[PDB]
Amino acid sequence: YPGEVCPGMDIRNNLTRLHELENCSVIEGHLQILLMFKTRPEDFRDLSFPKLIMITYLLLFRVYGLESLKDLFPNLTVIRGSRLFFNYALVIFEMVHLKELGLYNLMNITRGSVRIEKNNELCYLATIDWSRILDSVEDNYIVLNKDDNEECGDICPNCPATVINGQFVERCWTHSHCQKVCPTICKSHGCTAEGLCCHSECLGNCSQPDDPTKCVACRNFYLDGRCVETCPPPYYHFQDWRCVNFSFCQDLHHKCKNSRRQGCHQYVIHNNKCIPECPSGYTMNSSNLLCTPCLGPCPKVCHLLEGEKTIDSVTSAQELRGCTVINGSLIINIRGGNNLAAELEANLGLIEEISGYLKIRRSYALVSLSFFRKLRLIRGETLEIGNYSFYALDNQNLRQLWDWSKHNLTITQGKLFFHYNPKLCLSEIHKMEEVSGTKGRQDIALKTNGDQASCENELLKFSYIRTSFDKILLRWEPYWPPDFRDLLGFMLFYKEAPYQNVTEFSWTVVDIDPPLRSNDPKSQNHPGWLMRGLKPWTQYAIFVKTLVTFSDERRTYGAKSDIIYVQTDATNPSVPLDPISVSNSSSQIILKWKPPSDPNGNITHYLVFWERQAEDSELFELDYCTDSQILKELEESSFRKTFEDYLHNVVFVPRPFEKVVNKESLVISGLRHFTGYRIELQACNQDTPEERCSVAAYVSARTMPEAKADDIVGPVTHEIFENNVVHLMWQEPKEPNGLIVLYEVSYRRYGDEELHLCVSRKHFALERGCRLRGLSPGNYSVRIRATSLAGNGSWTEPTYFYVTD
Amino acid sequence: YPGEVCPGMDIRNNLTRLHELENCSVIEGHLQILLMFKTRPEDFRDLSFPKLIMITDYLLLFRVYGLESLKDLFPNLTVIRGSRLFFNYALVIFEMVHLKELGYNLMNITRGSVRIEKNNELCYLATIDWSRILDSVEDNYIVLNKDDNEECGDICPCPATVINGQFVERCWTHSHCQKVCPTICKSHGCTAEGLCCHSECLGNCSQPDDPTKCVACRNFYLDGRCVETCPPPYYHFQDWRCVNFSFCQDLHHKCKNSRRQGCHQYVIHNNKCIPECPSGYTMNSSNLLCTPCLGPCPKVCHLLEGEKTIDSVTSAQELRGCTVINGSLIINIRGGNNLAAELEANLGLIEEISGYLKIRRSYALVSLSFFRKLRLIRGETLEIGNYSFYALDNQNLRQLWDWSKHNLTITQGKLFFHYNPKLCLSEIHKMESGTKGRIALKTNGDQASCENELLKFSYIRTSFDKILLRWEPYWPPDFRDLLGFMLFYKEAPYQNVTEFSWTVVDIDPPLRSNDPKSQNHPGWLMRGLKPWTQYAIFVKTLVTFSTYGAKSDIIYVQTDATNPSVPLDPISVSNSSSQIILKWKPPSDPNGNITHYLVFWERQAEDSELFELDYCTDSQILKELEESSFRKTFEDYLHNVVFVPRPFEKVVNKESLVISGLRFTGYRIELQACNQDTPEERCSVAAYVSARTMPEAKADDIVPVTHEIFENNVVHLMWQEPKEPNGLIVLYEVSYRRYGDEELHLCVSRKHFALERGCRLRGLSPGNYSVRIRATSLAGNGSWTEPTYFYVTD
Amino acid sequence: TLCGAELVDALQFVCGDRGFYFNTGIVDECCFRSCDLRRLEMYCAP
Amino acid sequence: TLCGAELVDALQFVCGDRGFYFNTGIVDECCFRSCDLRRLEMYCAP
Amino acid sequence: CGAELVDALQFVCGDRGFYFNGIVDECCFRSCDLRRLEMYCAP
Amino acid sequence: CGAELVDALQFVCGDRGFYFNGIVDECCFRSCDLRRLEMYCAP
């Protein structure tokens, strides 16, 4: 950080205040630019702040005339995110004439997220990758701006591509810059232009690779001249990025002591950290600036103003971090559906004694209140309307409160309340009632909780299972409520679960009528269901549910069965698809196939068959020379029960084969040179006993031919007749290429022209070879070439004879 | 009703008690037979009661064994009046174990319904239709019998009727049918021949048009015959019987001397015998005629239970006529059947109830107007929680008392309103009765929107195929609350559509502006409608109800008349030689009432081939509304932090026409349909047909034959061409015969006719000859020419 | 708990030849809460 | 009532330069309930 | 249909066996489950 | 598709505005609305 250090600032109205960024390379706080309502692109064209390198949130809002930060902040590298704005470390809001971001030198945002919203001129938003900027991208928020209602031309000029939704797109900042994507090996340490990973002490960028002195921004801590991991022992940590010795912390403490109105703090050294105040259990001697553990208990009491604080963001909770005794009430009003369990537990975890009421008004994203990890006793000295020390409302996703098998909560005064908690079962609410000691000593809505939650405390139990191929039968012990007519039927759910990843919260639902009731504990024809059909190897998760009519004065949740993972027994697999005979040698063929798309069972080894094929007879012979669900709940289930009960009231008056293992290819040797071959391949899955393979995959195969196969050996023995007919006999090739169908005979009188004759195999057999007719008298020559299924072999040796008139 | 009468009875245990039905033909009450265990069919085969004719209140059979059919016990049970129902029904048969067939000759059940249930052997159920037996069939309830398992084969021995579009015969047993009567006779009844009975007969009569011969009497029965009303010497007893003064006197004296609980000191009022005359009338015994008194004497139902549970018609009927209640009332109507009429008739006179009033799980209720004269709820005996008016899980409740005129007073006690999904908060707030000073919010009005604010349409175009919609701008006190607009539309043949088949479309809010002037006037253009059909349109808002929203009223609009389409299924036939009768069906492809048709007919020359022939999401939206609130949250949060304080013919009304004045010829006809007549024409694309009149053989007749004889054995023939050829004379048939020789024929085509200028025979031997010529056309053959004779020289 | 279907069966099995007497109720006494022979036999005819 | 972008637009129109001051506000007292020139002008920098 | 009906019925029976007709008609009318096939075994 | 866009446009703005500032392509992008069509006929 070759520059000066300045605190956070807020700039508004006249642009002259923006000149206060004279030589500030790193800012010890947030930077805000706001309400520049009378500025044009002319004003922002010639102002730049390249010295700034690091920001500890950054917020821009309602700035007119500015088009881009490409010139304003060309070297802002890292935004730490120590103190977020709402839940975000960078906010760009209602920028009117902004066109592009231009923060190509921004590398990492350690903590928080980013929100750009309600712009009307910026572009290039879809061409930036946030996974390489901040870890948690699922909690970002860019909802409404330009290039979201009408796309821009985002001409990325240099710019590595990143995959999103399975498709690759290039990432760029402006029309002249692109995102710096360091390789995964460098991780957060960063890399230079050559791709060399920076030193572990660097974050994002470094002037020279593998040097803490050349880090653009220190990842862990910064000493007076170099990035360091934990600062030297004489230098304590400060603001999570600086290493400062006694002088700086002492000067800050003295300045705070001098100023009686500044919102400073009396800084203290603790655990090699200069911090505004050391946590509970430690007291300051006011002499050595080192706070020591206290004798009498001194909890970190945080006197809340106006007796009330509303928590709806990590910045609100962060104001209570390190607190142990809250001197006021507390409202939790998380919004948006973004999970905040980790930050809430980190900030409010040490809260033990709360001097007021606790209210959860509209916390939509909350799942549990476990983040009050050390919440021992609430006092309730300050109560809301109705005098409730614990309030719950509209918590849509709230599942459960503290783990009551482990927790121990005490409330002193006041009542509690619950309302519209659809995922909160009443059993947990009553456990809350009894564990806190409120009930009996001193509320819960009738039906607003667990409405969409499995409140069935009773557990069903499977009895017998029989799985086979595409069928499976289930059977569980009978269950009967006190009024057996209440049981409308059984609810069955099932899913295809490759692994254990289902927890009741996609299924296929099946309705089962109750079995006929039978007296005695005898066999009641144990209820069950027959599965319609399944894949021959899939694993399934199954559980059943009851369906019971509720009574106003009689609670009856029903029952459910624990989710059980059952995988059907295997069958024979399916035939592999796309086999090919990739013949490589005159006796070797490299068969290539790929596994079937539906193996219905793990492939252990392929079964290979190959049957020799005789050549076609044509070659040998031929001569070539919701209302409805509530509707069914009342007027034929409850109504049928009323008349039956009414009647009883009135009337009863009181007085060759090869197995290939883990390989998609096979090189079959010992094959013929060119003879056609038939191949059969099957997939097999459980063939430790006799084979149970699939059906055969069929391919015709043929090895590479050889010229020597069709070559005729030696000269041709000949005979001469007086009728100008010459008969000649030659040795047939021993191993012809598949089949020799015809022979090419070339004859020429000595020094004269050459003529050709076609002799077929039938002509070869009929005349016992060939017979040249019409030959002119004189010295003659003849040569023969053999034709096979592959081509033509070499000609015979020059044979010479004489023709007599 | 021949014979005597007997009171209602209940029979149990052994069967000897069934002998009590000795000879009485009328039961003045209910007949119950129950718990007939350890009894076999041989016991029920020899016992019959054919004398019994009429039962007043209801008939109940339950848990009888051995019995298989009522065809033997009750062959003449004519009418079940239904004066006093059991639960809501006048005939209940329950858990019959061996009953197989219902078993006839039963005509009418005036008041109530029938419930048959849990019968594991009963057949012959779907064979009967209840529209001819009782009035409100929708109130009936039969379920899960044996016949409901599609295993019973009901071999009817029987008039047939249609239900739900299927036609089937109706019978009672394997040996009887349903005695259906024509609609003219209706409730009066008809005999075997179909003659309507007398007006005082109900069901059937032995002799038609005679009050003395009615089997069952409608209105009232005096003596030997059925009368419309009791004669002045006689007063009405129970709705069915007329009795003299002495009868009621004897009843009163019996109730006086004998202290029998359950009977009443009968009096006379309005020429009727009444157990106790209603409020405003006192009693002083004497003439047994109660008279009005100045002193207020309201009917006090001193119910000893301390409270009542009205869940049935009988429960309300137990309070019939009472004006004040010395206790509480609980309303627990179930089953979904409409109960407004009976509840208003029984509890209408209720004025002040001493106890509280509860309405729990009343699924079928839609309004609490039954208490037509409810004036003051005392609330002295409050429900737990000290409530005078309680409401729970009334799933279909929509409206309380009409608050325009109804004036209710509550002495003390709170009010309760939970789980009323179709009850708007406006009604509840209006209720606060004088008890404003002295509710579960999200559970009320959930499916019944509470948009008190109204939207007004501004402009419409309505097109031969669409529509302009433009509403008035509406903004909540804080905008961004208006998520958008919900527009609903649906075709409506009649202007009788309700709010809850509808087609909906989403609309984003218009871009608002300060000093709005005219705004954008948000609207919508439709995606295609059938033009002439009337449509119903209403628009409602969609807001985060942290702003009740607004909803435009239902508006019925129909587009303008569009051009019609081609006529469908035309028919073209001929009845006379000059007329062609055309028929067509009113085309459904065009819309709008057909005003007139257009018929175009064009003559066609015969085919050229003939001339040339030589013959010879609730979860999904919940994310969005939470998202929208989150979107508004940050925007509000930023402002809090950053802004710091200091030839043609037209056919009218006829789908047929007979074009006259035509020629036999092939003819082309076009039919056009016009759904509007105000302009010169608003018609469609013509439908094409071709017809042909029947032949006129006389027109093809040829009027002797002019001939010449040549020396080359050739005789030329010439004849007069027909004046009106039937389409086209394709060829001419020439018959010639030498004297003493066989007849010979020659073909002369029209091409041959023109080529040789008629016809000429070839190779004629010498001798006498006779020749005739016949014309042949597309229609047939005409008459032959007159005989012509010629001689060939030797 | 004897409910709306087996209640008649149990009452018959208890009463036998006694029969049923004639001239809130029984469902709440025996279905909404458990009963004993003492209560069920009481409904039999004397 | 003043809310959303209308609020900032009206604040700019009222302030008429003069900037905005710095070193429950606004939304509760200008969007939840109506306000006037008195309240809005107060947020402009002196 | 009866084909798949018995192709599952033999599995749910094992050695209990069955007789082919019957249960086919009801299965064509009503949905099937264990209670309607376990009683159809013909030992 | 865009032809029916024209056969609705000459109805909604036949009196005036049936010209260009083109509207077919982004109507498949940004749906079709009455207030999304009167603005296009303004220029």
Q: What is the DSSP string of A430-447?
A: HHHHHHTT-TTT--B-SS
Query: B63 with B38: CB under 8 angstroms?
Result: no
Of the candidate CATH numbers 3.90.226.10, 3.40.50.1970, 2.60.40.10, 3.30.420.40, the domain formed by B453-511+519-558 belongs to: 2.60.40.10
- Tell me which chain C residue has its CA closest to the CA of residue A551: C32
| DSSP H helical ranges for A443-519 | none
- Is A142 in a helix, a strand, or coil? strand
Q: Minimal CA–CA distance to E32: which of A560, A510, A524?
A: A510
Distance (Å, whole) CA A660 – CA A677 = 19
Task: Collect all residues with Cβ–Cβ distance below 8 Å to A171 and sequence separation of at least 6.
Answer: A127, A128, A129, A156, A159, A160, A161, A162, A178, A179, A181
CATH code linked to domain A577-623+658-701 = 2.60.40.10
Query: C5 with B120: CB under 8 angstroms?
Result: no
Task: Collect all residues with Cβ–Cβ distance below 8 Å to B259 and sequence separation of at least 6.
Answer: none
Chain B contact partners (≥3 CB pairs within 8 A)? A, C, D, F
Terminal Cα distance for chain A, rounded:
114
Nearest to D43 among B480, B636, B645 (CB): B645
Burial of D38 (0-12, 13-18, 19+ CB in 10 A): exposed
Q: Minimal CA–CA distance to A1: which of A83, A69, A71, A77?
A: A77
Residue A601: φ, ψ to 5° = 140, 140
Distance (Å, whole) CA B234 – CA B253 = 18
| Rounded (5°) CA angle A676-A677-A681 | 155
Q: Minimal CA–CA distance to B161: which of B169, B173, B153?
A: B169
DSSP F20-37: ----HHHHTTS---SHHH
Q: Minimal CA–CA distance to B420: which of B361, B377, B368, B371?
A: B361
Query: A220 with A229: CB under 8 angstroms?
Result: yes
Q: Minimal CA–CA distance to A443: which of A484, A387, A482?
A: A387
**Pair type for strands A508-512 and A559-561:** unpaired
Interface test with A, best of B334, B384, B632, B646 (most A CBs within 10 A): B334
Q: State the number of CA atoms in the 13 A half-sphere of A38 facing the CB.
A: 12
Record: contact A35-D45, CB cut-off 8 A: no
- Is D5 in a helix, a strand, or coil? helix
Burial of B297 (0-12, 13-18, 19+ CB in 10 A): middle
Torsion angle of the four alpha carbons A701, A706, A709, A715, in this order, in degrees rounded to the nearest 10: 160
- Tell me which chain A residue has its CA closest to the CA of residue F31: A149
Torsion angle of the four alpha carbons B108, B113, B119, B125, in this order, in degrees rounded to the nearest 10: 50
Query: A98 with A119: CB under 8 angstroms?
Result: yes
Task: Collect all residues with Cβ–Cβ distance below 8 Å to A251 and sequence separation of at least 6.
Answer: none
Q: Minimal CA–CA distance to B589: which of B534, B671, B530?
A: B530
Structure tokens at B541: 């808002």
Residue A666: φ, ψ to 5° = -150, 135
Where exactly does CATH 2.60.40.10 map onto chain A?
A: 458-516+526-567, 577-623+658-701, 707-803
- Classify domain B307-431 by CATH architecture: Alpha-Beta Horseshoe (3.80)
Query: A244 with A238: CB under 8 angstroms?
Result: yes
CATH code linked to domain B4-180 = 3.80.20.20
Distance (Å, whole) CA B687 – CA B571 = 11
> In angstroms, what CA-CA distances link F23 with B238, B521, F5, F36, F43?
81, 21, 8, 10, 13
Task: Collect all residues with Cβ–Cβ distance below 8 Å to A151 and sequence separation of at least 6.
Answer: none
Q: What is the DSSP letter of B134?
A: B
CATH 2.60.40.10 applies to domain A707-803: yes
> In angstroms, what CA-CA distances link A221 with A77, A186, A227, A236?
15, 19, 6, 10
Q: What is the nearest CA distance from C1 to chain A, expressed in angstroms?
A: 7
| Rounded (5°) CA angle B244-B249-B252 | 135
Task: Collect all residues with Cβ–Cβ distance below 8 Å to A613 and sequence separation of at least 6.
Answer: A675, A676, A677, A678, A700
Our answer on whether F and D touch (3+ beta-carbon pairs < 8 Å) is no
Q: What is the gyration radius of the CA atoms in chain B, in angstroms?
A: 44
- A vs C: CB pairs below 8 A: 52
- Is B206 in a helix, a strand, or coil? coil
- Is A627 in a helix, a strand, or coil? helix
DSSP B459-481: B----SS--EEE------SSTT-
Q: What is the DSSP letter of A733?
A: P
- Tell me which chain B residue has its CA closest to the CA of residue F39: B520
Q: How many helices (H) and strands (E) does chain E have?
A: 3, 0
Distance (Å, whole) CA B361 – CA B418 = 11
Amino acid of residue A128: I
- Classify domain A245-293 by CATH architecture: Ribbon (2.10)
Backbone region of residue B85 per phi and psi (left: phi > 0; alpha: psi in -120 to 50; beta: other values): beta
**Pair type for strands B648-652 and B596-603:** antiparallel
Distance (Å, whole) CA B582 – CA B686 = 14
Terminal Cα distance for chain E, rounded:
23
Query: A389 with A415: CB under 8 angstroms?
Result: yes
Distance (Å, whole) CA F6 – CA F22 = 11
Record: contact C4-A554, CB cut-off 8 A: no
Distance (Å, whole) CA B771 – CA A642 = 104
Which chain B residues are closer than 8 Å to D25 by Cβ? 640, 643-645
Distance (Å, whole) CA B112 – CA B140 = 8
Q: Minimal CA–CA distance to C4: which of C20, C39, C28?
A: C28
- Is A458 in a helix, a strand, or coil? strand
Q: Minimal CA–CA distance to A88: which of A146, A27, A30?
A: A30
- Is A36 in a helix, a strand, or coil? strand
Chain E contact present for A529, CB below 8 A: yes
- C-proximal residues of A, 631-650, CB under 8 Å: 641, 644-645, 648-650
Distance (Å, whole) CA A250 – CA A243 = 14
Our answer on whether B and F touch (3+ beta-carbon pairs < 8 Å) is yes
CATH code linked to domain A301-435 = 3.80.20.20
Q: Minimal CA–CA distance to B94: which of B135, B27, B37, B145?
A: B145
Length of chain E: 43
Burial A513-546 (b: 16+ CB within 10 A, else e): ebbeeeeeeeeeebbbbbbeebebbeebbbbbbb
Record: contact B35-C45, CB cut-off 8 A: no
- Is E16 in a helix, a strand, or coil? coil
Distance (Å, whole) CA E27 – CA E21 = 11
Q: What is the gyration radius of the CA atoms in chain F, in angstroms?
A: 9
Where exactly does CATH 3.80.20.20 map onto chain A?
A: 1-181, 301-435
Q: State the number of CA atoms in the 13 A half-sphere of A146 facing the CB.
A: 19
> In angstroms, what CA-CA distances link B56 with A680, B52, B90, B130, B268?
88, 12, 9, 19, 21
- With an 8 Å Cβ cutoff, the interface of chain B facing chain A consists of 32, 34-35, 62, 87, 92, 94, 115, 117, 143, 311-312, 334-336, 360-361, 363, 392-393, 395, 418-419, 440, 442, 622-623, 626-627, 629-631, 633-635, 637-638, 642
Other beta carbons less than 10 A from residue B351's beta carbon: 17
Distance (Å, whole) CA A608 – CA A307 = 82
Technique behind the model? cryo-EM
- Is A646 in a helix, a strand, or coil? helix
Q: How many helices (H) and strands (E) does chain A have?
A: 9, 52
Tell me the torsion sign for CA atoms D6, D9, D15, D16.
negative
Distance (Å, whole) CA A181 – CA A169 = 13
The crossing angle, in degrees rounded to 10, of helices A627-634 and A638-651 is 20
> In angstroms, what CA-CA distances link A609 with A657, A663, A673, A742, D19?
5, 16, 19, 32, 90
Distance (Å, whole) CA B311 – CA B360 = 10
Query: A200 with A189: CB under 8 angstroms?
Result: yes
- Is D39 in a helix, a strand, or coil? helix
CATH fold group of domain A458-516+526-567: Immunoglobulin-like (2.60.40)
Q: Minimal CA–CA distance to B738: which of B692, B716, B775, B770?
A: B770
> Resolution for this model in angstroms, one decimal place?
3.3
Residue A754: φ, ψ to 5° = -115, 140
Q: What is the nearest CA distance from F6 to chain A, expressed in angstroms?
A: 22
Nearest to D4 among B477, B635, B644 (CB): B635
Terminal Cα distance for chain B, rounded:
114
Which chain C residues are closer than 8 Å to B37 by Cβ? 12
Residue B781: φ, ψ to 5° = -130, 135
Q: Minimal CA–CA distance to A60: which of A126, A140, A117, A138?
A: A117
Distance (Å, whole) CA A668 – CA B633 = 73
Chain F contact partners (≥3 CB pairs within 8 A)? A, B
Structure tokens at B565: 């389409």
Distance (Å, whole) CA B124 – CA B172 = 7
Q: Minimal CA–CA distance to A797: which of A783, A778, A779?
A: A783
Amino acid of residue F5: L
Structure tokens at B285: 């015994």
Which chain B residues are closer than 8 Å to C8 by Cβ? 35, 63, 95
- Is A559 in a helix, a strand, or coil? strand
Q: Minimal CA–CA distance to B18: which of B3, B28, B6?
A: B6
Helix (H) or strand (E) holding B608: helix B608-612
CATH code linked to domain B697-792 = 2.60.40.10
- Is B216 in a helix, a strand, or coil? strand
- Is A172 in a helix, a strand, or coil? strand
Which chain A residues are closer than 8 Å to E12 by Cβ? 473, 530
Task: Collect all residues with Cβ–Cβ distance below 8 Å to A219 and sequence separation of at least 6.
Answer: A188, A189, A200, A201, A202, A203, A227
Nearest to B629 among A32, A115, A335 (CB): A335
Task: Collect all residues with Cβ–Cβ distance below 8 Å to A442 and sequence separation of at least 6.
Answer: A414, A415
Interface test with C, best of A637, A645, A646, A651 (most C CBs within 10 A): A645
| DSSP H helical ranges for A402-466 | 426-435
Give the CATH superfamily of A1-181. Answer: Receptor L-domain (3.80.20.20)
Q: A239 forms bridges with which residues in the sheet?
A: none
- Tell me which chain D residue has its CA closest to the CA of residue A36: D19
**Pair type for strands B596-603 and B759-761:** unpaired
Q: Minimal CA–CA distance to A577: which of A701, A703, A702, A699?
A: A699
Record: contact A37-D22, CB cut-off 8 A: no
Burial of A158 (0-12, 13-18, 19+ CB in 10 A): exposed
Where exactly does CATH 2.60.40.10 map onto chain B?
A: 453-511+519-558, 568-614+649-691, 697-792
Secondary structure in 3-state letters for A211-259: CHHHECCECCEEECCEEECCCCCCCEEECCCEEECHHHHHHHHHHHHHC
Q: How many helices (H) and strands (E) does chain B have?
A: 8, 51
Q: What is the nearest CA distance from E34 to chain A, expressed in angstroms?
A: 5
Task: Collect all residues with Cβ–Cβ distance below 8 Å to A505 and sequence separation of at least 6.
Answer: none
- A vs B: CB pairs below 8 A: 75
Where exactly does CATH 2.10.220.10 map onto chain A?
A: 245-293
